[PDB]
Scaffold this active site. Structure first.
Site, mmCIF file in Angstrom:
data_model
loop_
_atom_site.group_PDB
_atom_site.id
_atom_site.type_symbol
_atom_site.label_atom_id
_atom_site.label_comp_id
_atom_site.label_asym_id
_atom_site.label_seq_id
_atom_site.Cartn_x
_atom_site.Cartn_y
_atom_site.Cartn_z
ATOM 1 N N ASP A 1 0.850 -1.357 -0.017
ATOM 2 C CA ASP A 1 -0.090 0.096 -0.159
ATOM 3 C C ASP A 1 0.939 1.295 -0.049
ATOM 4 O OD1 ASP A 1 0.676 -0.932 2.695
ATOM 5 O OD2 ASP A 1 -0.288 0.833 3.321
ATOM 6 N N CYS A 2 2.138 1.303 -0.049
ATOM 7 C CA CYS A 2 2.880 2.543 -0.079
ATOM 8 C C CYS A 2 2.639 3.453 -1.066
ATOM 9 C CB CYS A 2 4.491 2.178 0.005
ATOM 10 S SG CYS A 2 5.668 3.717 0.014
ATOM 11 N N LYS B 1 13.709 -6.749 5.397
ATOM 12 C CA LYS B 1 14.361 -5.888 4.461
ATOM 13 C C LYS B 1 15.961 -6.422 3.955
ATOM 14 C CE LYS B 1 13.170 -2.031 6.488
ATOM 15 N NZ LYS B 1 12.486 -0.728 6.658
ATOM 16 N N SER C 1 10.952 8.908 -4.445
ATOM 17 C CA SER C 1 9.918 9.157 -5.495
ATOM 18 C C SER C 1 10.108 10.190 -6.295
ATOM 19 C CB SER C 1 8.517 8.788 -5.022
ATOM 20 O OG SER C 1 8.155 9.906 -4.204
ATOM 21 N N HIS D 1 -5.671 6.648 0.208
ATOM 22 C CA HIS D 1 -5.441 6.470 1.456
ATOM 23 C C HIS D 1 -6.309 7.162 2.531
ATOM 24 C CE1 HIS D 1 -1.464 4.020 2.107
ATOM 25 N NE2 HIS D 1 -1.734 4.130 0.778
ATOM 26 N N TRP E 1 -2.230 0.683 8.028
ATOM 27 C CA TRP E 1 -2.209 1.912 8.892
ATOM 28 C C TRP E 1 -2.463 1.272 10.349
ATOM 29 C CZ3 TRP E 1 -0.897 6.467 8.752
ATOM 30 C CH2 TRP E 1 -0.733 7.243 7.400
#
Length: 215
Positions: free
Chosen positions: A20-21, A48, A75, A164, A211
């Site tokens: 969902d990022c 990670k 980004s 979101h 969340w």
């Protein structure tokens, strides 16, 4: 794949499932808007790889255009590099910077902030949604998106944050997008109609689960 660009995003590698990022979402929407091919590599936030700490401080999105290319995080850096290397199809935007600039921070301060500032944050959020709504209305002859008929750099940055906002706020607070923000509602319907959006829609439970990790 050494053939196309790799986009390391938040996901579930054990299920080949995108999560969902919203910043990963912005890069992905940017690639879809320019019809550029890419391959997603999913980073499990509970496991990670050590190299990602050096490449980006542990963060996603990261891209990797090939074996001789370096890893490139952030980004913002990514989408601007994208626009420089591939000017067509264009994603440049006439939208002023200040608009939507505090949508995500206010919405977050509402979800996970102190109660005393909540009323103020609700007010500020609604000023942001008002700005976006008015803008889309004054430009609705060009189309329902910030880029008229097709995705814009502003669409790529703001549409995930708005996604979101409506999903998470409706789930955790019963908050709802007012029906008077007409241009925002048709904006959402328009985005949900787009194949570019459909290709990389992670879904509302992904948002909720993301969340819940903090509420």
């Amino acid at each position: 794949s050494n053939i196309v660009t790799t986009i390391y995003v938040k996901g579930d590698p054990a299920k080949n499932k995108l999560l969902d990022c919203p910043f990963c979402h912005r890069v992905l929407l940017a690639y879809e808007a320019k019809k550029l091919p890419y391959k997603m590599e999913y980073i499990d936030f509970d496991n990670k790889p050590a190299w990602l700490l050096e490449a980006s401080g542990g963060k996603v999105p990261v891209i990797k255009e090939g074996p001789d290319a370096p890893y490139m995080p952030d980004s913002d850096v990514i989408v601007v590099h994208l626009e420089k290397q591939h000017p067509e199809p264009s994603l440049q935007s006439s939208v002023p910077a200040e608009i939507g600039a505090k949508l995500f921070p206010n919405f977050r301060a509402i979800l996970i902030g102190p109660a005393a500032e909540v009323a103020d944050k609700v007010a500020a959020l609604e000023e942001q949604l008002a700005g976006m709504d008015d803008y889309l209305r004054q430009h609705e002859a060009q189309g329902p998106l910030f880029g008229g008929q097709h995705l814009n750099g502003t669409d790529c940055s703001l549409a995930p944050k708005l996604y979101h906002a409506v999903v998470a706020l409706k789930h955790f607070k019963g908050w709802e997008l007012p029906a008077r923000f007409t241009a925002l509602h048709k904006y959402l319907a328009a985005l949900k109609a787009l194949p570019e959006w459909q290709h990389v829609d992670y879904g509302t439970e992904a948002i909720i689960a993301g969340w819940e990790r903090h509420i």
